[PDB]
Design an enzyme around this catalytic site. Structure first.
Site, PDB file in Angstrom:
ATOM      1  N   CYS A 186       0.826  -1.204   0.000  1.00  0.00           N
ATOM      2  CA  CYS A 186       0.000   0.000   0.000  1.00  0.00           C
ATOM      3  C   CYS A 186       0.863   1.259   0.000  1.00  0.00           C
ATOM      4  O   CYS A 186       1.710   1.433   0.879  1.00  0.00           O
ATOM      5  CB  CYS A 186      -0.919   0.000   1.223  1.00  0.00           C
ATOM      6  SG  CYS A 186      -1.745   1.602   1.556  1.00  0.00           S
ATOM      7  N   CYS A 202       0.497   3.655   3.106  1.00  0.00           N
ATOM      8  CA  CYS A 202       1.183   3.110   4.270  1.00  0.00           C
ATOM      9  C   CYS A 202       2.675   3.414   4.227  1.00  0.00           C
ATOM     10  O   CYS A 202       3.269   3.739   5.263  1.00  0.00           O
ATOM     11  CB  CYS A 202       0.946   1.601   4.374  1.00  0.00           C
ATOM     12  SG  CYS A 202      -0.749   1.077   4.836  1.00  0.00           S
TER      13      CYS A 202
END
Ligand SMILES: [Ca+2]
Ligand SMILES: [Ca+2]
Ligand SMILES: [Ca+2]
Ligand SMILES: [Ca+2]
Lengths: 108, 130, 134
Positions: free
Chosen positions: A33, A36
């Site tokens: 991600c 993230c």
């Protein structure tokens, strides 16, 4: 890898309560991600700067099925603050160091 | 049975994609003809890339519309440059051709992108997987 | 969703402005309409807009379309056709794999090498693909 960050599993929870003492910041995250990764350096600094006052922890949503569902995780990163086992606050999405520090100090 | 992460830009909303996956439009399994012209004959591959930055011009229709970038994990993809070599027509796309498409269960999440290339601060998880 | 775009055409030897309608429907149904002075000249349906446009130029054989998507050496990649619904294509050169800097929007203006049929464009693309082999 951040030296002082601990990595949680489903066993570290009993239902919605965290079995880890004190003030704990959890990031629900995933390796793939982009958002993230944007905040990984900010979480590294916080883990260094708040040592002894806050544990910073990560829960990999690809590794652990029970806990994200218990807490209704729909998006990542989700930051979830715990105090003496109980959830006190939640923030979804990448954020600046300034915003994260304001979030923590207002609830701790 | 090795799995890899790949990415796809698409104008279709995550409500549809999370439910139905990425479907192909044809039966042809010929990778050489897929590369020449994947509509003549229509090919049984869905295009994905290992380079997420390559999705943005497509998802935004060259900076004109908003769209989405999807992330998936699969073990059945065919590395096009690996199969075609020097004559791969668009080598820099770093294309992973997915035969028969991508099941909804292998799609991990979505992140929207507006026409100016600005994206969400977060990824929405596929509930068909989480 | 409905998207609209004005383009330039050569109709009866005079340059005119025309209006394109893009209607993206479920089931990957792409619809392309062209209006000139508020008259619909033609429409085409397909699963991507480069195919729609080629079919539209085939219906309107006497009109020159001053668009990149009409250019003899422009063609979408598999990936660009699939991910952008055919709206993004490449400007190609014999012997040279296509690069990101060669990407174009098919309805961006172009006045060179556009007085050519969709079949001529498709034949050139086959020559280009073959030119990558030494
Ligand atoms: Ca405080
Ligand atoms: Ca692997
Ligand atoms: Ca058609
Ligand atoms: Ca060459």
């Amino acid at each position: 890898i951040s030296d002082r960050i601990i990595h949680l599993a489903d066993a570290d929870f009993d239902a919605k309560k965290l079995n880890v003492k004190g003030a704990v910041l959890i990031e629900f995250w995933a390796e793939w991600c982009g958002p993230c990764k944007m905040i990984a350096p900010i979480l590294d600094e916080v883990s260094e700067e708040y040592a002894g006052k806050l544990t910073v922890a990560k829960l990999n949503v690809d590794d652990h099925e029970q806990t994200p569902k218990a807490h209704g995780i729909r998006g990542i990163p989700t930051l979830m603050l715990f105090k003496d086992g109980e959830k006190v606050a939640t923030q979804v999405g990448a954020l600046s160091k300034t915003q994260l520090k304001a979030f923590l100090d207002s609830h701790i | 049975g090795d799995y890899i992460i790949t990415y796809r830009g698409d104008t279709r909303s995550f409500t549809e994609i999370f439910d139905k996956g990425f479907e192909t439009l044809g039966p042809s399994k010929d990778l050489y003809k897929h590369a020449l012209d994947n509509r003549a004959p229509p090919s049984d591959f869905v295009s994905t890339t290992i380079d997420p930055t390559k999705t943005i011009s497509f998802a935004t229709k060259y900076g004109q519309k908003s769209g989405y970038m999807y992330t998936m994990k699969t073990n059945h993809g065919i590395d096009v440059n690996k199969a075609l070599g020097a004559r791969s027509p668009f080598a820099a796309e770093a294309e992973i051709a997915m035969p028969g498409g991508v099941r909804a269960e292998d799609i991990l999440g979505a992140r929207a992108v507006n026409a100016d290339g600005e994206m969400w601060d977060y990824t929405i998880l596929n509930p068909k997987r989480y | 969703d409905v998207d609209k775009r004005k383009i330039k055409i050569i109709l009866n030897g005079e340059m005119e402005e025309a209006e394109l309608h893009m209607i993206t429907s479920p089931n990957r149904h792409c619809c392309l309409k062209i209006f000139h002075n508020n008259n619909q000249l033609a429409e085409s349906n397909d699963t991507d807009y480069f195919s729609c446009f080629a079919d539209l130029r085939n219906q309107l054989k006497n009109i020159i379309f001053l668009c990149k998507g009409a250019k003899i050496n422009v063609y979408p990649s598999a990936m660009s056709r699939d991910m952008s619904d055919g709206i993004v294509a490449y400007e190609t050169t014999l012997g040279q794999p296509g690069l990101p800097e060669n990407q174009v929007h098919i309805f961006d203006f172009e006045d060179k090498y556009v007085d050519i049929t969709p079949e001529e464009q498709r034949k050139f693309h086959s020559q280009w693909f073959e030119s990558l082999v030494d």
